Amino acid sequence: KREHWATRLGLILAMAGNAVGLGNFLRFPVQAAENGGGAFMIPYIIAFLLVGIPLMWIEWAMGRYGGAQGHGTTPAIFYLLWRNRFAKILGVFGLWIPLVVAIYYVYIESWTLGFAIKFLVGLVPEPDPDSILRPFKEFLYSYIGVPKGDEPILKPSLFAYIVFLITMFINVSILIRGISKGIERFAKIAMPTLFCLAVFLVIRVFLLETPNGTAADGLNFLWTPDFEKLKDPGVWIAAVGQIFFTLSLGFGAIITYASYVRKDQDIVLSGLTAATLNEKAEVILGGSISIPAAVAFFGVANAVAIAKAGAFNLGFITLPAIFSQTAGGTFLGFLWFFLLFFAGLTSSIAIMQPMIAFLEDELKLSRKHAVLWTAAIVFFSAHLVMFLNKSLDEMDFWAGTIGVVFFGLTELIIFFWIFGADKAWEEINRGGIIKVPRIYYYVMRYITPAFLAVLLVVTHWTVWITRFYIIGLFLFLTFLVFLAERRRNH
């Protein structure tokens, strides 16, 4: 009647791979560097405690609950908790967000496979600072085809394109095998390899020393409070957006994975362990690679200005430029890209599974066909992100930034207010190997929803191409929900 995680360890490593992704190694460092370093960290830690943890529990509980009744996605699950047609509609966001995010994230992930291939085989640039960074800027710019003139059009390289195809093939070959034999098996290999590669890279970074500094200066920058910044709302917004992204909250992905957890299996400890594994990967591992390397070679002020330059400057340009000045630096680049790739891959399979679970659960497609149609929608749609300059940024904003925070508050209200605070509490704790601390009941019912509602309260014409397409996506998925509900009646 339903697929199930085979083992507790597999469960937890799958969920950890869901969370531990590009957010940890690329987004975190830039977010932290742009927002004062340790000035970012206080709100980040508070957000983890007031949003992260409690939404994680709530999403596992929603998933396990839907899964016991044969439903893994939010159009059905929201309706099970609130019997109103509007529940189904709000529910479409938890298919739309992950699909929209999958569209650009799988492409960025393919970049890491491509750069990994090129770094391994040594087809890389050979290098004044601008004189060292420029060939790496050009190498990224040719790969993705950054516009050279006024037209907002991208020309990715043939190699970029084919590597996107291979990346899709790889996602598909894991997903097509299912939960236990696909995602779970694969997490048990990927997560230890990922942890080992990151540890190696931190160790190697910790030894960098130049006339402008050492790695320790980067660790000081990141872990040193600046209580002046606690007053700035932007830091708080940045901190909470990062918490959501990094924990996969509000993307419907945690829910969908929890729907393969057996009805009475614990979610309290398992939920907290996944969350905690992600935070360690983010702040110890992701926090100790990029910022420290950048600071050791350029000093703080220049590392910050680099972070501010682009989402991708640090990870795809600067870090390999820095590695190129060290013995075996091209192979270190390889290992960094290969780290990003398995990090991406364990996350992208998590953000495709919701659309798969919808097609299997609500429309009764076989797994084969659900995975293939999903790959086809994501592949097709990614042509927008590959060819239209700033389409990616637009999707990341509506779905990956705003959308997720909105959807997180929505699922909280649906589960904890409408369905019932006490019934939600009970459902979270049922089968617990530990119980949720009792103060969290008040955090979930009052603090988390207030925190988020407060935050929420506080371009070129081609953006409309992207808005139009991703609104069309929402209408298409709303239509599929409609068909699913008409298949129930027959």
Added chain:
Amino acid sequence: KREHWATRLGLILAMAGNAVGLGNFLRFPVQAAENGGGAFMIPYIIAFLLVGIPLMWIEWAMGRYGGAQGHGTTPAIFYLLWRNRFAKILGVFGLWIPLVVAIYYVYIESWTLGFAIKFLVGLVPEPDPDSILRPFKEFLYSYIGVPKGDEPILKPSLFAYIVFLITMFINVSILIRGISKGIERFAKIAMPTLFCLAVFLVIRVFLLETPNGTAADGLNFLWTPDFEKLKDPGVWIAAVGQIFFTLSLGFGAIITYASYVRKDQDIVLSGLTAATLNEKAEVILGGSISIPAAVAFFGVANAVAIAKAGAFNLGFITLPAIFSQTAGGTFLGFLWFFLLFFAGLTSSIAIMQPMIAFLEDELKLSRKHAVLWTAAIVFFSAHLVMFLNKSLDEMDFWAGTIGVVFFGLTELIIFFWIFGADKAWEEINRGGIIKVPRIYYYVMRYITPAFLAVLLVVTHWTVWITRFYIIGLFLFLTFLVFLAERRRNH
């Protein structure tokens, strides 16, 4: 088990309204004027005899045949005639073409409602020739929002937009009532009003006389052979493309309408009468309004240069400019626009019904829901045509020009070669009130397919926005076919 046309007269007037549309009054005159006048007419007449007539019969026969088995659209019907999965796929064109065409045609139709409203109420320009034409050029340009600078972006007026909404509401209110009570009832009112308004307009045009000419000079220009041009392939291509457009061949619309014809009711005479009613409306009525008026005021050479200027110059700019120089010219403009509107409306409901019939027949939606989802897809998608300069031209090319000729040859091969020439023949003639002339058997099996295969053998970066979207449409409809075939299995 199926909706049926109530009456033979209603049947024929519905099919005549399917055919008799904007093609007759706007496209024909421009096609004919651009291609030498009577130089166009010889190939046009030959195409009517070798493509028009025989494809009309074939499409009615395919429709009646599918309809007896509960299927009105080509994914199912192609499969019934050729039991191969590839038949279903080719079949998607006969949902995709009409949907794509509906997207831009309904918008152009809304223009006619808007101009009709403005002309009736006198909110029109008041007017050297350029001094008379320019205010009408501006009035069209503001209405649709033609770009004023370098960006390929349209800014339709608020009034244009709301009138598009009303136009959609009107299409919907006919379609939602069904075949007999909606399309059929409405054709019995619209077609006599349309014929009366056109006759009035021809009479009024026939009286125009200026120093540069009379209406008769325009009739001479159109009906005078130029045997030099018979050698030019472009004239032949133009002539055949017009035949398809004007008869609605290759848009899946004739088929879908024929699928509501009772199994043993005649299609030979009915088919020929519809075809013949359309040709008379095209060459006597559409041919005697615009070209003669234009020639009487400007002389032939200037009328030709006007035709060549744009698809819409003649009908939306020049003709009202000319009417403005005559007593009661603003009301004559109204009657012209109102003529175009009912002409459009009787055709656009025909090109939405295929998607409706698919949703009812293959996915079992009620009529209400099938009409509403269809209106929603068309409304949504039309934002591309409303806002992206030359998107309309792009859709008209792929679907309305190439697509239809390709699809016409495809349905011919499927029905007359694969299924069986003799079985096709028999199926066409069964229930005939007359029989198809026997020479036509050879035309259909050999001449029509050769003619079309021979013809078939013989921009700005934003075109890719439109190509991308309408390829996405094809994939979406292919997916719906897939769901439909999986609903059969369950």
